[PDB]
């Protein structure tokens with residue numbers, strides 16, 4: 001339904017647009033994965049690569065049957081950032097915050113059970 005798509009887009013836009021107390025947009029690095037030719041090491045280590053552009057494409061093309069499916073893909077993105085990057089590094093830390101930002105956005109926008 002158009003309502004579900006509106007909610008998914010509103011949730012992902014909250015995640016994308018989020019800035020920390022310093023005004024930095026944390027999603028910046030995660031919008032588009034570097035190409036396989038630029039960073040082959042990433043694709044050698046990460047089995048299911050995904051970025052925010054792909055998640056937007058999947059919402060747009062009606063590929064998520066529920067908000068749970070959308071969540072699964074956002075969590076996979078953050079997991080891959082944490083798998084590839086060192087614990088304590090900025091990319092690693094940013095992905096942890098974005099998991100939390102998605103959950104707050106889902107609770108606020110969707111107002112479920």
Ligand SMILES: COCCOc1cc(N2[C@@H]3CC[C@H]2CN(c2cc(-c4ccccc4O)nnc2N)C3)ccn1
Nearest residue numbers: 029030031032033034038050051077080081084085091
């Ligand atoms: C147009 O911009 C697209 C990205 O541009 C880039 C960015 C590159 N970077 C190198 C180091 C910093 C930045 C982002 N980097 C990473 C990106 C990601 C990543 C990006 C999107 C989605 C999930 C991810 O885990 N994960 N770990 C990284 N270390 C790779 C390397 C080559 N092209």
Ligand SMILES: [Zn+2]
Nearest residue numbers: 033034035038
């Ligand atoms: Zn690049």
Ligand SMILES: [Zn+2]
Nearest residue numbers: 005060061062
């Ligand atoms: Zn459509």
